[PDB]
Amino acid sequence: QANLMRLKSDLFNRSPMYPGPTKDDPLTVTLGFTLQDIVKVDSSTNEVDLVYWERQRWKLNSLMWDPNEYGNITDFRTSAADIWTPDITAYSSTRPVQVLSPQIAVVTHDGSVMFIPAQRLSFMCDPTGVDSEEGVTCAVKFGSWVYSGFEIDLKTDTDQVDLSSYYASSKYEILSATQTRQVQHYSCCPEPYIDVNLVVKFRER
Amino acid sequence: QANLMRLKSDLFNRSPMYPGPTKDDPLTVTLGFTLQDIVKVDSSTNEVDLVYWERQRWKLNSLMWDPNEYGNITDFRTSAADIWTPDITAYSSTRPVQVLSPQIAVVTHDGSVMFIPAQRLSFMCDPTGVDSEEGVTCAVKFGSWVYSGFEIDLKTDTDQVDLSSYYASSKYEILSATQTRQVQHYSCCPEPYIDVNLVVKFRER
Amino acid sequence: QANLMRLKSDLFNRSPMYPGPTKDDPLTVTLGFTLQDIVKVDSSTNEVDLVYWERQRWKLNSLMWDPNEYGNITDFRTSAADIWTPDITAYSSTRPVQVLSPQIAVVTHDGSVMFIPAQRLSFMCDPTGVDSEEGVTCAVKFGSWVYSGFEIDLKTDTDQVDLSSYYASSKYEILSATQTRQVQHYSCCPEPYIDVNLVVKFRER
Amino acid sequence: QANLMRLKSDLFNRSPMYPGPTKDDPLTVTLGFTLQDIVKVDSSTNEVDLVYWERQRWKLNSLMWDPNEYGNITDFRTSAADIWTPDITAYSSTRPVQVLSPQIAVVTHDGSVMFIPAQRLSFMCDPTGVDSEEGVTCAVKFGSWVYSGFEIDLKTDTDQVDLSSYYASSKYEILSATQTRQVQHYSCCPEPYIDVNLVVKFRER
Amino acid sequence: QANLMRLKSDLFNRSPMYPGPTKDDPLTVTLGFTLQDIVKVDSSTNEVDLVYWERQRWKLNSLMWDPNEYGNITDFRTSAADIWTPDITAYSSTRPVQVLSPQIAVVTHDGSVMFIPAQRLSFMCDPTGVDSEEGVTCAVKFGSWVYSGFEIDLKTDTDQVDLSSYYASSKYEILSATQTRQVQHYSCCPEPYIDVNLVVKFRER
């Protein structure tokens, strides 16, 4: 406990928090999705509710330490409130997102952080055709709300959404599920914005 | 990170927060709306739910800096809780507004601030006729709850509500959508109050 | 900004907060209602939902200042959390009251405070007869939860509820709406309690 | 204000906050219920919703003062967050309890505290027979979650639930309503736990 | 009070909080369930809601004391916010878990902590067959969200879920209810992970 208390103290009480990335010191955030269930489809409002886990990873020089200085501690867990986290948001949500898991991150001595919030999201999706063989496709994208591509870049480790924890007795069968990095330009802004587009095709039964 | 940490420290830890505008030092806030979806219409209570983004912009002398003094930083992102924000509210809401996006603002070296909260709002609207060709019109206005025109003035950059992110498969088609600055007088107060009236005409299909 | 910062500092950081009224220094609170809409009537549970604004006014010697000492500032706005506010509550609510407006008060150099929270309230009301010509009457009273008439007295400026912002396309037509000071005696306590009874008669169409 | 400010200051500065009772210094808490309405009955889930006020009273020697030392102040009001409160809870709730009143307590110069939260509670009750002449009986008990009878004892001033503010036009007529101190033994623990059982018999009309 | 105030001060104000377990100083958490009611079954979304109490127990050296040094105090109660608690969570929840009890723990002089949050949980379960004689079985597992078996080991004192507080008039009869420790290795990770699987078989009537 003593070494870990000392490490945490040195990292969090002896320097200011990371103020976030800039053009001169950009940050890459890696993002993948584990889809656990499609829990609700509402055809009168065109809303669909998912439960999923959002794997986020990034790295900061300010979170590095030498394990030999701290009794060979190579990683630790800490409340997400103790560290900077990126402002990744769903772009087509219809309700505030509901957090289903403790808000705790894993920090490793090379400065890398892993944060995996489980969440329920309501989003815009017309589910007409969900009860046919072809099913229906919807999409929702995730990205920084206020940082451009020049400050926060996103990547994925894979194009396939992790379906290995998908609820075996869901009302809905997943026909396809992809996660794809996209570069968007909007008319407002000259800077590109980066998102990951989660596209899920699904049907009943 | 070092220059940005120093800038933030100089701005936020070395003087009190801006106490808000007065008659002697008024403020102009620019306001525009991006309508993303009409998500619910309830004819038994005359409530309609929108999801929209509220672009807000204003400028403070107390947020200015010379980029040459701070490693050429010309702007940065910061939690909206670190700065004064204006008390703009919907005047005919029926439920507390639900915030859908991180509460983070962009501050620029000329002292200008941009804040773009995405929100779900329930408001008073009789939707009778929504299922006809003519559709139905409702309106909701937005302005400061407690500052008059002598302290906070509003303007818009345009009269047209931004419909470029409107959900392509909404239950509702937008026939018209305007945002108009208006001057209101209340019996309580001799000073005029300023609002922006969001008038949306829409129908099913 | 400098004068206002100095005033706020002198008022709030240089003495303790007002600890509330006592028998020796009672306080009069003025109370008036602006009824904006009857948003819901539920005959299966006997609940009715209103949206209204509650004008509250009181005066404290400890909030006085000479405008000549503070660059001629005669009033300012401040977060309701910076000041004492009275514990006025609805006595027949069925859900926590939902605040619809920013919680900001106006303080004037004579020590008077104006606070106007907009609210949605669910309360006990049997709406049988709402769909007839005679309509239906319900009532809900508002007063301090724990201060007796010896500490907090209530008055109204008028007996008529302000209907000038009542939603023109409500499901419900207001036949009558009054606000009336009353004295209540409880078996527990020898001291009378003061409330304002809001009585609204209404019907459909 | 001055004497009261001084009293509050002196009481805040006497010790840390009361750490709660122990075997060596137990505490008796007095408990009574005012039943305001039965607001909802759900026979598909066996839930019933009540609105009631929970009178709680206890006494601490550390909160005593001589009124002659403080300009004859014999009592004052203060936020419930400024003092220790007991952990009395409903034992068969199905939803978090909703607080309907300001969280303010009354402290008296003999060290007694009165706290009267108004609340809406959903709880386990099979309402079969509610629509007959005999009606239906349900029960919910209230006690400390973690203090045994050796640390917190409960009493009631009366066996009869106060029905004097029961809503005159409720869907439900109250046939009987009692509050009875009981001793419960759990298999986990050798110590008895004390609760007050609120038993309400009621029917429609 | 005096001795207890001194003990709490020595434990909580004189050293940092426990930073959680590591490979070098692991922790065992004991876990058991008291099932109070199955409150809702939804076959259109495959969600089931339970109300249960989650008994958690662990031990820390940093929470030990000699009772002779503190007026023979052998245990005390304290807000769960004063101490580290483990991040045990349901792995297939569909909603944020609702806490139904005060968040207070019992600490004993040997450093052991008992924490018993009562909760309402919605989780993934297909309730087809609930209305037959055989009934239906569902399952949900609980474990640390971020600590492996090398940091947090889980055990149960018994395989049987405590049914002694199960609501006598539930819609649902419990045919079987078990809690079983399971040790997993996943391909992603070299560390073993531990969960407790709560398996409940039930039917109507």
Ligand SMILES: O=C1c2cccc3c2[C@@H](CCC3)CN1[C@@H]1CN2CCC1CC2
């Ligand atoms: O709409 C604007 C916008 C409009 C006019 C000026 C500016 C903007 C930028 C922020 C600075 C300058 C951000 N956004 C949105 C925030 N988020 C959602 C879409 C865009 C991009 C990412």
Ligand SMILES: O=C1c2cccc3c2[C@@H](CCC3)CN1[C@@H]1CN2CCC1CC2
């Ligand atoms: O009702 C009052 C009011 C009443 C009596 C005195 C005063 C007021 C002002 C504040 C100044 C002094 C604010 N308001 C509301 C705030 N907002 C909504 C309606 C009005 C105007 C715009």
Ligand SMILES: O=C1c2cccc3c2[C@@H](CCC3)CN1[C@@H]1CN2CCC1CC2
């Ligand atoms: O029940 C009591 C009560 C009981 C026993 C002692 C005392 C009380 C007072 C507070 C002082 C002393 C307030 N109340 C409630 C708070 N509010 C609503 C109902 C009553 C009256 C006004």
Ligand SMILES: O=C1c2cccc3c2[C@@H](CCC3)CN1[C@@H]1CN2CCC1CC2
């Ligand atoms: O289950 C236990 C329990 C189990 C093993 C040890 C201990 C307990 C006590 C706390 C002290 C030591 C409290 N409780 C619950 C909390 N509350 C409700 C049910 C009981 C009784 C009162």
